[PDB]
Enzyme design. Structure first.
Site, PDB file in Angstrom:
ATOM      1  N   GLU A 173       0.684  -1.059  -0.626  1.00 18.11           N
ATOM      2  CA  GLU A 173       0.199  -0.146   0.038  1.00 18.11           C
ATOM      3  C   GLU A 173       1.003   1.112  -0.571  1.00 18.11           C
ATOM      4  O   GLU A 173       0.520   2.081  -0.943  1.00 18.11           O
ATOM      5  CB  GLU A 173      -1.209  -0.029   1.177  1.00 18.11           C
ATOM      6  CG  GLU A 173      -2.078  -0.986   1.025  1.00 18.11           C
ATOM      7  CD  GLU A 173      -3.116  -0.751  -0.208  1.00 18.11           C
ATOM      8  OE1 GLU A 173      -3.230   0.369  -0.828  1.00 18.11           O
ATOM      9  OE2 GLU A 173      -4.036  -1.496   0.108  1.00 18.11           O
ATOM     10  N   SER A 188     -11.891  10.575  -4.138  1.00 18.97           N
ATOM     11  CA  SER A 188     -11.653  10.427  -2.998  1.00 18.97           C
ATOM     12  C   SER A 188     -10.110  10.142  -2.363  1.00 18.97           C
ATOM     13  O   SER A 188      -9.100  10.318  -3.864  1.00 18.97           O
ATOM     14  CB  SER A 188     -12.230   9.040  -1.946  1.00 18.97           C
ATOM     15  OG  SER A 188     -12.184   8.530  -2.510  1.00 18.97           O
TER      16      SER A 188
END
Ligand SMILES: [Cl-]
Ligand SMILES: [Cl-]
Ligand SMILES: [Cl-]
Ligand SMILES: [Cl-]
Ligand SMILES: [Cl-]
Ligand SMILES: [Cl-]
Ligand SMILES: [N]
Ligand SMILES: [N]
Ligand SMILES: [N]
Ligand code: NA
Ligand SMILES: [Pt+2]
Ligand SMILES: [Pt+2]
Ligand SMILES: [Pt+2]
Ligand SMILES: [Pt+2]
Ligand SMILES: [Pt+2]
Length: 129
Positions: free
Chosen positions: A35, A50
């Protein structure tokens, strides 16, 4: 802050992630690697407007407030900026809410595609835990 692998393992363990909702520590370290590459300041913008924040790339659509994601929620009740701290508490606490949402760690697309079903233990190998 860019965490070392075992450094992050140790912090995640201390904060209660090891086997949280049945997910071994290696799963969490693997998720963090793919990530954010262990970088607390990582940010990534999603097509829907977002933004993902921090070591576990927690998203503002549902989980944090950044004042710029229309229609969104803030279910962890934090400013998204708190997820960028060298202190991972807010990230871990929020991740605990996410992984309890019903889909477990599949909530993290990178986990499903790059960690799930792999030898995740390798991510904590060598670490003094
Ligand atoms: Cl590494
Ligand atoms: Cl593990
Ligand atoms: Cl917003
Ligand atoms: Cl911390
Ligand atoms: Cl915590
Ligand atoms: Cl599960
Ligand atoms: N920490
Ligand atoms: N903690
Ligand atoms: N915690
Ligand atoms: Na939000
Ligand atoms: Pt930092
Ligand atoms: Pt900590
Ligand atoms: Pt904690
Ligand atoms: Pt906890
Ligand atoms: Pt690396």
């Amino acid at each position: 802050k860019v965490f070392g692998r075992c450094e992050l393992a140790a912090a995640m363990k201390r904060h209660g992630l090891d086997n949280y909702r049945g997910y071994s520590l290696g799963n969490w370290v693997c998720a963090a690697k793919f990530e954010s590459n262990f970088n607390t300041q990582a940010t990534n913008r999603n097509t829907d407007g977002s933004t993902d924040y921090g070591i576990l790339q927690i998203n503002s659509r549902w989980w944090c407030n950044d004042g710029r994601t229309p229609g969104s929620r803030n279910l962890c009740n934090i400013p998204c900026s708190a997820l960028l701290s060298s202190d991972i508490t807010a990230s871990v606490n929020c991740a605990k809410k996410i992984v309890s949402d019903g889909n477990g760690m599949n909530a993290w697309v990178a986990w499903r595609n790059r960690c799930k079903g792999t030898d995740v233990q390798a991510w904590i190998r060598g670490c003094r835990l």
